[PDB]
Design a protein around this ligand. Structure first.
Ligand SMILES: [Mg+2]
Ligand SMILES: [Mg+2]
Ligand SMILES: [Mg+2]
Ligand SMILES: [Mg+2]
Lengths: 509, 504, 507, 509
């Protein structure tokens, strides 16, 4: 699984014109099912299955219309009495922009205690739906927070009592990471196999999911091949800091966006990620403070007059970053009619400045507070760069004002960047947990709990931001949520198996 | 103004012209440039406040929010109270919290009293204090201090424009003043300010004339609707439609909400007629039938109520069904159950009050207000406004709004106490019976309740909520409208706001 | 940071009898390593590591004997400056004189400047820089080595690839080892030694264990002092928030050894009183009240204390009671009543305060020498050092106490250093007084004061080699108070507090 | 070759203060060239020329820095495809402690056969670099062994086909002995004249090499004068044994160490060598078994009570040896702070014991196996004595443990001692060759090849030992390799000519 193999990818695709034709036929049939009459709860379950299979992109309009009709109903008898239905309706409506109040769950609470009634401690699907629905909550929605802790504890208790292996796998999967926090492409790969074993499974939807996944995978294989050839062309692959960073970066980009129509944007994002990995090793280990300061100054000024001062192992990544930023800016000028080079140069400069600040603290024995560390670390995570670039390459009618606003890191973008940083720190000198430990003296386990609380808080803010008015539109909103999901999935070897399963091996038909 | 024949004629001949619209959009672009353009921060705050007072905030909301965000170094404002109070008020008004401790510097820690000639400074402090919440004692003290000082300095002012402004603030703070009426008054006041921006003044005059033309068309349609219903021929509520429409203008004036405003005016007109029917015209047997028919939404027996009562009940029934259908057609959600339910609840509240009056009951203030908040008719008006404006309406949301949660309840209670203050047994009398206190002390107690409920409404605005615009503005604006309407004089306000254009 | 918390300290100790046993076993092993044969440069480096880790108190005689034997087979170090400098610094630090001419061979005869080749060895530059602070006045070769090594280390700091070495270089540039407080530097060095390539695991483990054991003693001391402070009731006074914890940290800088816990606590008590009284004279007190406070202290007669208000009388009585208790402790343990000396030194300190207040109330602007002659007394170190001498000197007598109270050159240098160090770290102070005396700019004046710091240190270094009536541990107290001042005046004290006093080192 | 002349040497030196000043000026210029930018192949060739001229001691640090930078240049295009560059880089890097794998030569091998391709048996310098590089190989590196045999056969074939006399001389010299096995001082003298006639010669380096040679020669002349006076002082000059033996020992010692700063150690080594020659003759010819047994027992006990039992001709060498060993131990005590008398006495005891064992085998008609003969002969050659003494007089902070370890026969020292013994036996009743002949009955020619194979094997072990971790450091490492080189040089009259050329006659300027 080296570069010679990756460059080869995309030459021979398993999919055939017959497979694509059957896929478009099944797509029409699935569209008919989605818009066709169905019992409301059944429709909600089907729509959820379509989303879980990674097919929401194909039927986005039909799904939204169907949910809207199911929402504006003067008859709530079908769902109000049982929690499983109430939770499924609450989650799907919120996920598609239709607000459902938390008060919908008061009936299931003890008025005196305020805790959820134990009568649902027995139904696994009821607990699973409540648990998933609790992650769509906003700040101050204490009913949802109680549902979260209740369902989490109950699912942990009932996990061992489950007899059906498929259900046990589903429950363990949800406990590990809720659907709301799971990367769409990877979850789609897992769900195809899980959905196959469900008793109430729809063969047409399952077949379409397998065919569409294989067809999209062929696009991904071609992109892996082009990116691998690009990386070898740059020569960063022969550097120590590259390692398997290029393929890892592509996997992260797959988590951010997997749709075929965004292949060019995805390739550019993967390039930025690969550069991030190589420069990360250069600043963290290889570079000397004098060399790194020169690297940062060169980036801030966009002047390569002294690159020749730096040694080859440092100069080559700096020039590759410079050339890539210039190419991405030119691509933006050619396709979107807006020169993006000033923004790409600025975001790389800001990222390098953040690295310089951390290196200076590491060299001066400073120990920052959690808020001080995070203010720099949200920038240093590299996502501000990734999100701004994604906005520049996808926004409709780009302008200096719009790019400047996104570059300002408003609350919606800031929440995502902070989440990526804290999630990364959670998975593994001084990180969020250690900074908090020094700030409060608390034990490592309690500090980790505090950081986890921050994770939940930032997700609540992201969820509310999706409902607030915003200048952003699709697909930037999805990029912002998906980078967080990709981080959750990637920071819980095993990455080689996920790479082969999602990108290399097709699903057998 | 009080002739249906005259009102129906309106909308046929509009004073505005395409040239006026073009000049309006040119000035609008210039004002946007000024609002987002560089300016000294205190100057920017003053300009943004002036755009609001001219009733132009709807046109430049995002720009203003940004400029205020940028305004939120801090040396220019921390030292001086005039600047501190203006920044505090504007920031709180736009969702940026500013603590009351910002006024700690301008008060002796040694003495719990704001120290003692800036009239504008006192005005800014007074207005900012009404943006205060419960428990913000610094703001409350600043309020009482500024009120006493402004009353004291009112007589020492030589400049008539400033004297009018001070007297106006003493009459009603900006926070409690109806936006459209205040905008009309401020246009003339702003004209006389030395540091006035001519472009902003022109845009304010032009935009007012255009909106007024929209209101004239709405008045014509509503007048024709009223004569079509025939309630105009009945004896009660002489000239109630125009009154109801004026109240609705206070609630919402923006043109894009004309259909919602017309429907709100229709409900108001029905309130005016049915209120007279229950308090004076109807007999207890007739009222009980009217209430039962509304609660069950079955008109089988309407033919038992005499014509003078049957016609209002049927107009109410048809109007509620029409509003519900309009909701079904435009928002894809049948609102007839909610319009019927809120009218049933309102009639039930009337029946309960009539029974208390018929049984010599004297309720406690809390007992009276729990029913009176419903009887004022604002739960009906606010729920209808929510049904007609919320994005993606649902049964859950309508049920929640209909439950009268704290945000809605505060507005309803405020409107009831405000009406009673302006004007059987009311809030003041009920308190007098509950504590035996004198009328003057009781009125002060009610005024304190008004301030308390305003603090709560203000607090609700910064907490997370299911509600968003424009419902949040409907809730605050109905209270402002009540303050304005319950301080003849309505004919002069009618001609000035609805009929006569501002001369150019 | 909370008095309830500090009083709570000492209730639950992390250390266990097994940990103590393992500590004494490792101690024996470290003793064996310190006295056993080893290559000379390696031995010097090991001894230096022992000193930086704060273990010198445990292994002091073996270190002195080893250096004595090392002081005739001396060829191993003459060739390289790094070894020469390490030998010079450690020998001077341990009382074995080494002449400055030992570095002339590495200097250019014509120019008199050091050869640029030593710029290649980072370790070489570090040893030269540290060795330059052990110099006396007139040792110009050492002074040149100082300026040279400082400039070279600044130049090579950015060129270092090893992060641990880079951290060490930046730390030395911030403050040389000679000027760093032993306990705080020991805490910092423990972590660095783990990441040093040439680390001894037994010594490292012992350093971690011994630090934790000493920390338990400090926690108990903090608890005792916190209960004492609340008992006095000065905690509820508006003045001197967290004065007690800052004073205890300062005492830790002055002396950290466990056997001196009682003396350290008394020093901390004096410090806490100083913190409270400073606010009373500088801010809270009226001229009439302060003049009365000073007269009461001079007479050691409290008949008129009730004239003062409660907020000012309380600190005066607590100071009076504390001084009487410290004097009694001296009488009971050392068989010599120290109350006259504690009363006299408290009198001389507040009179100082009165003299400064007189300058402040009459708009006087003193010359630097005039200001410092009073300010050395006002900093409070004469009081702290005299009390420390009274509580530690062997067979105390009136003559010995009078001599120390006279502020001879060795004590005076430390007092002046502490006052100027405080002024350097923080309306006329030492710097401003110089600015008025010479009209020079603030930037030039700061350099002049820094020069004074180096000069006074040179005098202290020479005094350590001159014959003196003073012996240990007073000599260490005198040097350590200046080191404590350098460390404390470079918030951040909370970060040093948690690391040194509250949280144990994980094993 | 007369003691009066040797004692006379050192009185009048040809060098002048001007010559030294010019030497230090040229030294700075050569140092500048060594650290200055240069073409990579040119730099490798220049460093090789500096080493061949015997100037490595002067620029040891600059050479190490230059080679260190050359190993991580990353740009490998200049050497990866050229055999000459690949071999030169491999040899120089290994010689300076930078490991280079044998696989670097696979590209130049025929994949099917595994033999080297004939395509490069035309270029003489290419073959020369390959041949020299092959002697830096370790055991199990069959590629290097093949390179050795291939290049040797090809160089023999093209030697007669070479037209350029300088190239023909270089090829003939390499065939006689590779650079790796050549004594540094003697090779430096030989190379100076050849380098002058090489087309790509650096005049500054040539001049510095000639000047430094003259200065070092003056130091050696002074050493010869002192040693000659010491020898006449001992009075073993007039004894029948070891005629003209002292100077030979000094010449041999020059091969072991030639640097002027080690003159004192070199003089002591020369003294030991002279004593070895005289006592060797005493045991082999002059002494009776009774006298030799007494000599060995007296040496072993280090008790001279019975010296008067021995005749004057034997007592004088024994006493001179006793006084010299005691003096060397005292010198160690004075300069290194460690009394070395027990070690000098012990190594002389071991050497005499080895002589006694061989004489006993000779008197009992024993025929040892090759391993049996070598086990004693490695001690009898006298290199264990010379190496232990050299370690005692130069190691930093000597200790009983280090001296005991060196006195032991660990792999690094033992390999060198065995090599010196087998090389000496190869050059000249039963020795290594005859012992093998008796052990296997094999013919003399096959036996000589087997011993040569042992020489190659032990050299491979020495090369690996230099790369293995060791307690030993410089200059002991150099002494251990150089004693082997000195043996190769001394055993294929001609030594008188080499003496005059290296020690007496200066290079004309
Ligand atoms: Mg980094
Ligand atoms: Mg009524
Ligand atoms: Mg003071
Ligand atoms: Mg022999």
């Amino acid at each position: 699984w080296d570069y010679d193999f990756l460059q080869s990818l995309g030459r021979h695709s398993s999919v055939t014109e017959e497979h694509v034709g059957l896929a478009e036929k099944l797509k029409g049939e699935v569209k008919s099912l989605i818009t066709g009459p169905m019992e409301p709860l059944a429709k909600l379950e089907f729509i959820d299955s379509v989303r879980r299979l990674g097919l929401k992109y194909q039927f986005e309009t039909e799904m939204k219309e169907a949910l809207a009709n199911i929402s504006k109903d003067g008859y709530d008898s079908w769902w109000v009495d049982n929690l499983r239905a109430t939770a499924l309706r609450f989650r799907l409506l919120r996920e598609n922009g239709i607000f459902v109040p938390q008060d919908v769950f008061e009936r299931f609470q003890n008025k005196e205690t305020g805790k959820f009634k134990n009568e649902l401690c027995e139904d696994v699907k009821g607990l699973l739906n409540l648990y998933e629905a609790s992650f769509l909550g906003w700040e101050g929605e204490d009913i949802l927070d109680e549902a979260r802790t209740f369902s989490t504890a109950q699912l942990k208790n009932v996990e061992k009592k489950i007899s059906s292996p498929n259900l046990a796998k589903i429950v363990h999967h949800a406990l590990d990471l809720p659907l709301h926090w799971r990367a769409i492409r990877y979850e789609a790969r897992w769900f195809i196999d899980i959905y196959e074993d469900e008793e109430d499974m729809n063969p047409t939807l399952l077949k379409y999911a397998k065919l569409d996944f294989n067809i999209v995978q062929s696009f991904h294989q071609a992109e892996i091949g082009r990116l691998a050839r690009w990386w070898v062309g740059t020569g960063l692959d022969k550097l120590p800091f590259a390692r398997n960073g290029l393929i890892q970066s592509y996997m992260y980009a797959i988590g951010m966006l997997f749709e075929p129509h965004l292949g060019e944007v995805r390739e550019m994002e993967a390039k930025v990620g690969a550069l991030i990995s190589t420069i990360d090793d250069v600043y963290d280990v290889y570079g000397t403070m004098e060399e790194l300061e020169l690297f940062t100054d060169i980036t801030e000024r966009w002047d390569i007059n002294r690159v020749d001062q730096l040694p080859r192992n440092i100069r080559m990544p700096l020039l590759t970053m410079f050339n890539t930023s210039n190419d991405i800016g030119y691509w933006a000028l050619k396709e979107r009619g807006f020169n993006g080079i000033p923004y790409t140069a600025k975001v790389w400069a800001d990222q390098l400045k953040s690295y310089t600040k951390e290196a200076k603290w590491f060299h001066e024995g400073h120990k920052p507070t959690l808020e001080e560390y995070l203010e720099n670390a949200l920038v240093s995570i590299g996502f501000p760069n990734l999100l701004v670039t994604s906005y520049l390459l996808t926004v409709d009618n780009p302008t200096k004002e719009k790019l400047d606003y996104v570059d300002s890191l408003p609350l919606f973008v800031r929440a995502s960047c902070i989440l990526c940083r804290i999630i990364n720190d959670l998975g593994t000198n001084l990180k969020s947990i250690q900074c908090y430990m020094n700030e409060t003296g608390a034990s490592q386990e309690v500090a980790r709990e505090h950081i986890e609380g921050l994770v939940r808080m930032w997700w609540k803010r992201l969820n509310k931001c999706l409902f607030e008015p915003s200048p952003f539109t699709e697909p930037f909103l999805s990029f912002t949520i998906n980078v967080v999901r990709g981080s959750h999935f990637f920071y819980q070897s095993w990455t080689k198996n996920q790479g082969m399963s999602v990108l290399i091996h097709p699903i057998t038909l």
